[PDB]
Design a protein around this nucleic acid. Structure first.
Lengths: 271, 147, 77
RNA sequence: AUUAAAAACACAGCACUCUGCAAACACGAAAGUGGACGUAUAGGGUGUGACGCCUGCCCGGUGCCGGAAGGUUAAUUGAUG
RNA sequence: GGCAUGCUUGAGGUUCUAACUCUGGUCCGUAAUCCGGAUCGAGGACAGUGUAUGGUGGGCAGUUUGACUGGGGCGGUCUCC
């Protein structure tokens, strides 16, 4: 993590994250495919999600989440950059070829973990079911329906903690603060996700956000009464309604969960 | 409403007619063959098979007497992990336990089970709720040893 | 469309009268759910979306009197 | 676009809050699609606008959040006269 | 008074699977995983959907907001002795 010298008006506050562990140039080619840019537009053609557009060409990488190979020792080749994600991914190699990308744990550059219904059991990077692990451990990549794949604790530097165990349900405390009960045969992976040098970065200039795929936002007090309920005014007005979405939704604190189907699996709400 | 044909439920009889909820007869009894709606059309045929109904009531309990001598033997030795450590590390099983109670027990296996007490804690003999009835069940004894 | 495969119920229209008689339009939709019905002759479930008034008529004739005249007006079950 | 190029709008940066995945949210009579083939170091919304030193008191009014003890309170039942 | 147990019935609590549910897994139609069908896995009388009813609801719509007046706006005045 380096600082930049103020040579220009853009370079004054750029904070980079450089890494020399990353493999310089190539992706492995059969694990790579085409991805198109949406613009934030559904099949009616209209903008649903605002402030998206532009950017750069990207290839989607088929990152493996199931880890269904069992009893095979896998050996890491190298750690690569992945553009549609905040973590680093690793290239694996099993005992008989069959290379494959996974989310990289804290271990890097040819360790050899073992992916099984239980084996070699404890490292960073061993996948094994959630009943055969000690309490108080830190895991990541947690399935919720068995066979479906990792859904929770998957972004950069993220993890969860085991707390309790009884019956079919193995309770864990999420990164947010919510404590879920999770069914016990869903697999998970010991350790933490690789790139934690990511909350320490600053873009510096206005055109740095724009070549990543985020389009300018405009405030609601600088519009007309026809466009946004904060509306127009004379001079700078305090927008004399209570603060509200452009569709009429209260925004400074209003509980909006209404699922009413998964409420049994939650122990404690996030506070 | 319907005419009963089974005797091993909690209200069943030989040929008594009962009045039950519409969802309990539509969904459960009739698509298996344990009851029949009361009619006035084939009633000359139901009276002819009353001798065949009581011979069927002297055979369903006869096969059960030659069956209970193989269920409570408790000779099933499940090969789970966690030999001599103390911490839960064994393969408990929710789909592989139905094949274990069918290779040396009753051959029926279908587990649509509502359970928050599925997996078991540290190494020892505990109980797994298995498919035993259709509107109740109790838990079956499981032996967990080393591998 | 929201029709039944036994009784032939369709959506109708009407009003939505207030307490000062401000007429405005709504639709009356028939109750109708998916459900599976066992037959004995073809020994298989058939699934067809019927009303709750279609569930009562199936409780009257039983399955096959209502299945046959559904075929005898030329439909897929 | 064709009388207004600004002190206006943007902005990197800052804070608040909602969202545990079939997510909040949006477009759709509905099927479904965006979000996102992403998973809280993420995604929506509202204000202020690099940097430096800082951000005081008031919870009565209005809104949101929390709590149920007690009061009133909807069709639905229909005693009694 | 209650004693018992029954007969029915409300309200609450737990559990079970067979209804419904699965934007789960693998077979089949199929050279497609959209859609079905078969089987296991999860939830489970909840969710969800009709119809009757409460609440919130400028998100949206149809509309109303008088006259005399030494210009009309402000103020004063509209009936009876």
């Amino acid at each position: 993590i380096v600082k930049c010298k103020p040579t220009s008006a853009g370079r004054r506050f750029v904070v980079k994250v450089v890494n020399q562990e990353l493999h310089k140039g190539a992706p492995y080619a059969p694990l790579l495919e085409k991805k198109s840019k949406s613009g934030g537009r559904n099949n009616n053609g209209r903008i649903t999600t605002r402030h998206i557009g532009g950017g750069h060409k990207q290839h989607y990488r088929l990152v493996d989440f199931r880890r269904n190979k069992d009893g095979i020792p896998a050996i890491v080749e190298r750690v690569e950059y992945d553009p549609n994600r905040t973590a680093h991914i690793a290239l694996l190699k099993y005992a008989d070829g069959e290379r494959r990308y996974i989310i990289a744990p804290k271990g890097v550059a040819a360790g050899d973990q073992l992916i099984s219904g239980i084996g070699a059991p404890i490292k960073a990077g061993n996948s094994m079911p959630l009943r055969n692990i000690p309490v108080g451990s830190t895991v990541h990549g947690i399935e919720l329906k068995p066979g479906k794949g990792a859904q929770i604790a998957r972004s950069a530097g993220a993890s969860a903690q085991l707390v309790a165990r009884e019956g079919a349900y193995v309770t864990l405390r999420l990164r947010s603060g919510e404590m879920r009960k999770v069914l016990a045969e869903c697999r998970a992976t010991l350790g933490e996700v690789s790139n934690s040098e990511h909350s320490l970065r600053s873009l510096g200039k206005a055109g740095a956000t724009r070549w990543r795929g985020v389009r300018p936002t405009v405030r609601g007090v600088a519009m007309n009464p026809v466009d946004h309920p904060h509306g127009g005014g004379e001079g700078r007005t305090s927008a004399g309604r209570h603060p509200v979405s452009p569709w009429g939704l209260q925004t400074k604190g209003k509980k909006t969960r209404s699922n009413k189907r998964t409420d049994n699996m939650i122990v404690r709400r996030r506070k | 409403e319907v005419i009963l044909l089974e005797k091993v439920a909690n209200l069943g009889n030989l040929g008594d007619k009962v009045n039950i909820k519409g969802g309990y007869a539509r969904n459960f009894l009739l698509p298996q063959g344990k009851a029949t709606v009361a009619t006035a059309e084939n009633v000359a045929a139901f009276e002819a098979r009353r001798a065949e109904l009581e011979k069927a009531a002297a055979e369903k309990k006869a096969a059960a007497e030659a069956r209970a001598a193989q269920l409570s033997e408790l000779v099933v030795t499940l090969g789970a992990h966690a030999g001599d450590e103390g911490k839960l590390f064994g393969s408990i099983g929710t789909r592989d336990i139905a094949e274990a109670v069918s290779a040396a027990g009753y051959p029926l296996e279908k587990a649509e089970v509502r359970l928050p007490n599925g997996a078991l804690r540290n190494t020892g003999e505990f109980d797994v709720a298995v498919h035993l009835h259709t509107d109740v069940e109790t838990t079956l004894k499981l032996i967990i040893v080393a591998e | 469309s929201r029709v039944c495969q036994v009784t032939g119920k369709g959506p109708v229209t009407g009003n939505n009268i207030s307490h000062a008689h401000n007429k405005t339009r709504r639709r009356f939709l028939p109750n109708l759910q998916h459900h599976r019905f066992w037959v004995e002759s073809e020994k298989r479930f058939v699934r067809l979306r019927v009303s709750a008034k279609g569930m009562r008529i199936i409780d009257k004739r039983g399955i096959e009197a209502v299945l046959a005249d559904l075929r005898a007006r030329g439909e897929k079950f």
